[PDB]
Amino acid sequence: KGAVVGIDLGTTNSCVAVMEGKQAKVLENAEGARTTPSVVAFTADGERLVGMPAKRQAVTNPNNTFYATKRLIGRRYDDPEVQKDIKNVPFKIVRASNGDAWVEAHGKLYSPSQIGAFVLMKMKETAENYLGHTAKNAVITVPAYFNDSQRQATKDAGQISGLNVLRVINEPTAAALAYGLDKSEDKVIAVYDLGGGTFDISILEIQKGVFEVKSTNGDTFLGGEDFDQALLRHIVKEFKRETGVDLTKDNMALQRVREAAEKAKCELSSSVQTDINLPYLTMDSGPKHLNMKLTRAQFEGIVTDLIRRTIAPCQKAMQDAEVSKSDIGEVILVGGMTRMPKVQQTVQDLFGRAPSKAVNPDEAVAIGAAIQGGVLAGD
């Protein structure tokens, strides 16, 4: 019947694709972007913002901007992960009536499934533009370590947006599907997944097309957003030095700096030097214009410990898989952050092999979701 959309409901960003003919097609939203920030915010008047609009005010509206709620979905408030999330995020996380971990803004409570549903709502609108009719059936990916309550709460997010979630599949298997590993006779796979919010490493074994997850590790609090924050703190400090003006108390300026830091980071994936240029950042004797040259080497030095924190979970995951570098047939990169050359060289060093880059790492999981969806559609 109707095509089945595949949605990567991501910690930081989300992506939707659908089978068109013999290949999956990634769909772009109304803003022209092929991914959508998994961000939901409520302004002082109570209007709701989703995606890029919410992201663009995250720093000036920290109390009422929900982000990385995938860290809460399907979790009890007393889960140590939730308590760790409370220490790391500024919006209010609260204990629901059933002891579940919920969020709160302006006196109103929301479950993480409701926040996810708002994101999925947007994913659905994006898909329906392309399809020309209502999207009924959905395949949504989840991390391999998600337990039953976390899978169920992701399905319920889908239902809230009107989607019949025909199946939930693990993100590293979805990515492997995007790479055609579905027909592998005997092959061990490493899936290195550095997203905007979280880091995952998974060791998969494929035998006659059967996927087994042999080990899982990572750091739920290591993502590209931390690379951006570390570049922000370095910018704030160099500014306080050259000008004597301290930006930390200036959320309007910090929002500009966070935007600049993420832009600069991404340019350095492709060139060795980039310019941070923020005219009239502060009007402190007169205006002060921020203008810094940032090199790849400097940025690599600023984020060194962040990249290195991916090494020990990977070695741990090979130990738990009773696998060695030699036994790993292929390493696949997932997440935007793996676009960074130093990250790719760190992956190379870990697994003794050039990682595969054949599939856009931002989009591989959504693509695999769509492939699974086409299978379910019989096509």
Ligand SMILES: C#CCNc1ncnc2c1ncn2[C@H]1O[C@H](COP(=O)(O)OP(=O)(O)O)[C@@H](O)[C@H]1O
């Ligand atoms: C070549 C080149 C330049 N291209 C890039 N260079 C560095 N970073 C990039 C990036 N294009 C996206 N990014 C992102 O990586 C994180 C989100 O990735 P993500 O997988 O979608 O997040 P989630 O899975 O958690 O939802 C986020 O920091 C953002 O900079």
Ligand SMILES: [Mg+2]
């Ligand atoms: Mg990712």
